[PDB]
Amino acid sequence: ELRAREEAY
Amino acid sequence: IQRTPKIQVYSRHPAENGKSNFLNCYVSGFHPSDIEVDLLKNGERIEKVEHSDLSFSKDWSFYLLYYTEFTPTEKDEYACRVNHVTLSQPKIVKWDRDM
Amino acid sequence: GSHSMRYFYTAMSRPGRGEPRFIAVGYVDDTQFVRFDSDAASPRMAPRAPWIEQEGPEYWDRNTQISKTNTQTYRESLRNLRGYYNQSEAGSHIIQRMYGCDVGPDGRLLRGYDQSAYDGKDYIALNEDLSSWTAADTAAQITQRKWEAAREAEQLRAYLEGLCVEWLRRYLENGKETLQRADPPKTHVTHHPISDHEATLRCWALGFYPAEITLTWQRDGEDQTQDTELVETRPAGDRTFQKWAAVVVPSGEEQRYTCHVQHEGLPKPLTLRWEP
Ligand code: NA
């Protein structure tokens, strides 16, 4: 299961 | 900084003339990810070769497996041809049947 | 014993050839189980192991949407890192990210991971505490400050201690007949003459899973590490792996040499010698 809602670099 | 591919050419199962097998070209250790890989039968490109999904190792270098079903014979010569930005010309690695 | 889940992201710009490509692949231990490719005719999270196929439509839609959103977010990130390094619009650049969790035999979190690279060099990584960052350089410090302001480490920790271990435990049960089965290597020793002076002894290990293995040559019981040619472990294509180790031996001294094999699938470690 992937991690959702990643912040951009 | 760029890294040149390592190349291994080998069969899935121990090779037996006349019996179906898989021919593998495993390319690894390279960066960046763009790479051109052909499998050759007597010098000619084999059509419809499959490959694995792009992934990478702990040191961030990429690896891919190119493979096709084949039936080895005594006459036939197999090879893997690889081009990459690090290579002036394509590298040809022959399937060393006996190992 | 212990087990891991990892996702591997690669985002690659290609100026003049469209928008950056985003690829994601997921593994449990040494078994790939999902893939996503933004270049696909219709991009979707797709199964790559039979035991993940039983997940329902909600799973596939949710992981597909996350991957489609990541395609956009990683395009933003590539634009940002190009600026942090003062790079032109003309070059191709790559962000790579690996994240996931290790669990013990009882399913408890052993350690979490989140690590990133830019053009093949370490860029920023979550520390083992799952609460602070290590930045490689002053560009990565910009990402660090952004992620500290957003409390992103707290989001990673929540994922790694929660969803990551929960779904890894689910996958391990659903795929237990393969993921929790270790297949031992099939082994043999070959002899390749070089000259009247020397021959090569090669120790083979075939068809093992997982990839972790130890192959060593000894001479009179002493490890021959400096003299052993050790090929990189390589996939067979049927989930199993292959490896060999070789040593050049003086003619007639072959019986002083032993090959030692250690692998989780073996009842006991193997000791092999050439059998003419
Ligand atoms: Na080239």
First to last CA, chain A: 21
* Whole-number Å distance between alpha carbons of B29 and B60: 8
Which of the listed residues C181, C211, C229 is the one where a domain comes to its end? Answer: C181
Helix residue spans in chain C (DSSP H)? 57-84, 138-149, 152-159, 165-174, 176-179
C199 and C170 fall within a common domain? no
Q: Give me the residue label for tokens 């190992």.
A: B99
- Domain spans, chain B: 1-99
C74 C-alpha to center of ligand 1: Å? 28
* Whole-number Å distance between alpha carbons of B28 and C129: 32
> Which residues of chain C are within 8 Å of residue B29 when distances are taken between CB atoms?
232
Which residues neighbour ligand 1 (ion) by CB within 5 Å?
A: B 83, 87
C106 and C229 fall within a common domain? no
Q: Please count the CA atoms within 13 angstroms of the CA of C183 that sit on its side-chain side.
A: 17
* Whole-number Å distance between alpha carbons of C177 and B12: 22
3-state helix, strand, coil in chain C (%, to 5): 30, 40, 35
- Number of folded domains that form chain C: 2
**Do the beta carbons of residue C22 and residue B54 sit within 8 Å?**
no
C25 and C122 fall within a common domain? yes
Rg (CA), chain B: 14
Which of the listed residues C130, C146, C181 is the one where a domain comes to its end? Answer: C181
Interface of A with C in 1-9 (CB under 8 A): 1-9
**Do the beta carbons of residue B10 and residue B63 sit within 8 Å?**
no
Q: Give me the residue label for tokens 């979490």.
A: C112
Q: Give the pair of three-digit tokens for residue C218.
A: 């000894």
C160 and C191 fall within a common domain? no
C113 and C187 fall within a common domain? no
Q: Give me the residue label for tokens 């469209």.
A: C18
CB contact under 8 A, B6 and C10: no
B7 C-alpha to center of ligand 1: Å? 15
Which residues pair with residue C258 across a beta bridge?
Answer: C218
Q: Give the pair of three-digit tokens for residue C21.
A: 């490509």
- Sign of the C-alpha dihedral computed for residues C134, C137, C138 and C142 taken in this order: negative
Which of the listed residues C156, C181, C206 is the one where a domain comes to its end? Answer: C181
C162 and C26 fall within a common domain? yes
State the method.
Answer: X-ray
C147 and C82 fall within a common domain? yes
Q: Give me the residue label for tokens 């619009």.
A: C89
Q: Give the pair of three-digit tokens for residue C78.
A: 């590539």
Q: Give the pair of three-digit tokens for residue C1.
A: 């014993």
Structural domain including C217 reads 182-272
Q: Which of B39, B4, B7 is nearest to C231 (CA)?
A: B7
For C63, nearest residue in chain A (alpha carbons): A2
Which residues pair with residue C214 across a beta bridge?
Answer: C262
Q: What is the number of other CB atoms lying within 10 angstroms of the CB of residue C135?
A: 17
* Whole-number Å distance between alpha carbons of C164 and C143: 24
* Whole-number Å distance between alpha carbons of C106 and B93: 46
Quick one: resolution in A? 1.8
> Which residues of chain C are within 8 Å of residue A6 when distances are taken between CB atoms?
69-70, 73
* Whole-number Å distance between alpha carbons of C210 and C207: 10
* Whole-number Å distance between alpha carbons of C22 and C45: 12
C136 and C234 fall within a common domain? no
Q: Give the pair of three-digit tokens for residue C259.
A: 């090959």
Q: Which of C193, C198, C201 is nearest to C244 (CA)?
A: C201
C131 and C56 fall within a common domain? yes
Q: Give the pair of three-digit tokens for residue C34.
A: 């999902």
Q: What is the number of other CB atoms lying within 10 angstroms of the CB of residue B61?
A: 19
From residue C77, alpha-carbon distances to C8, C11, C84, C147 in Å are 16, 9, 10, 13
Q: Which of C248, C182, C249, C262 is nearest to C215 (CA)?
A: C262
